[PDB]
Write a protein that binds this ligand. Structure first.
Ligand SMILES: CNS(=O)(=O)Cc1ccc(Cl)cc1
Ligand SMILES: CNS(=O)(=O)Cc1ccc(Cl)cc1
Ligand code: NA
Ligand code: NA
Ligand code: NA
Ligand code: NA
Lengths: 166, 166
């Protein structure tokens, strides 16, 4: 089922979410299925559970169709560790902040760990857009959105209007 | 005539505007008239010329109808000076950033100086919302918008969704 995505300004996006403790359950697999459905109907590349007012350390992300393909992934209890100090700027937008985007610095190289909805462990090294998406969704699980990370406010604006060439 | 208001992301909002040098002219009085018309149709309380892609140190502002009434004013070549170090937080939104608002600290007490469209000097002390509006519009004449002034990102969100009690 498609769930409503709450927008920036909702206090429910500013919470620190507790862990998932029902790995392997029918209830988790249903929530994850709704998340993938929801993300797809909104044409997102990532969606975290707090964005559908579900207070849990859970996100879905990934796509074929521009950057290189990111595998379709549902990840509970995510933990992230940079694998280098190197930062890279790139464009970010967010389904909870419709119409806008900005340039945001992220770590270029990370590892992330957690669990798939069936309880099996996930751990991967990621770089570039893949790594960016996982950092951006992880921020939602700690009550953070991308505007508080903008450094260059010239790059923040409506998608149909911006002409900034990063 | 009503003019289009350009939105955040337009480079034309990020310019430093030159002075008005046609005080008393028919062309200035027509531009000012369009600005008041434009501001009123959008229900604004302030509008600066860069917001209608006119690169000039010129703003209009003011209203009867909530804060205390601010006199309807057209002000060219504005210069602002704080009259105290005291800052105050308050809600700001912007016609070039439709749908959003945030809490922004401004100087509580200022003087501002410049010229009315007929060339006569204007100088006034202002406080509270009056002072805030003039500082906010003045920022447009130096290529600045309110997001680069937010300190507490919990307060930034869509007007129909926020429940932050300042
Ligand atoms: C999940 N969000 S994100 O910032 O990491 C990926 C993204 C990048 C650019 C745009 Cl316009 C939208 C989303
Ligand atoms: C001209 N802009 S402003 O921030 O100074 C006045 C204002 C205050 C609150 C809202 Cl929601 C909109 C405008
Ligand atoms: Na928070
Ligand atoms: Na690690
Ligand atoms: Na600028
Ligand atoms: Na002064």
């Amino acid at each position: 089922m498609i769930r409503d995505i709450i927008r920036m300004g909702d206090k429910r996006l500013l919470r620190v979410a507790p862990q998932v403790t029902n790995l392997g359950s029918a209830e988790l697999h249903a929530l994850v299925s709704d998340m993938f459905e929801t993300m797809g109907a909104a044409h997102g590349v990532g969606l975290a559970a707090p964005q559908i007012a579900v207070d849990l350390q859970l996100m879905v992300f990934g796509f074929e169709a521009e950057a290189p393909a990111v595998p379709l992934t549902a990840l509970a209890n995510a933990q992230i560790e940079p694998l280098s100090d190197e930062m890279e700027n790139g464009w970010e937008g967010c389904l909870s902040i419709p119409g806008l985007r900005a340039v945001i610095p992220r770590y270029r190289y990370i590892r992330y760990r957690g669990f798939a909805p069936d309880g099996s462990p996930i751990e991967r090294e990621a770089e570039g857009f893949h790594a960016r998406v996982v950092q951006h969704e992880y921020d939602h699980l700690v009550g953070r959105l991308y505007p508080s990370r903008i450094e260059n406010f010239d790059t923040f604006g409506f998608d149909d209007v911006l002409s900034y060439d990063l």
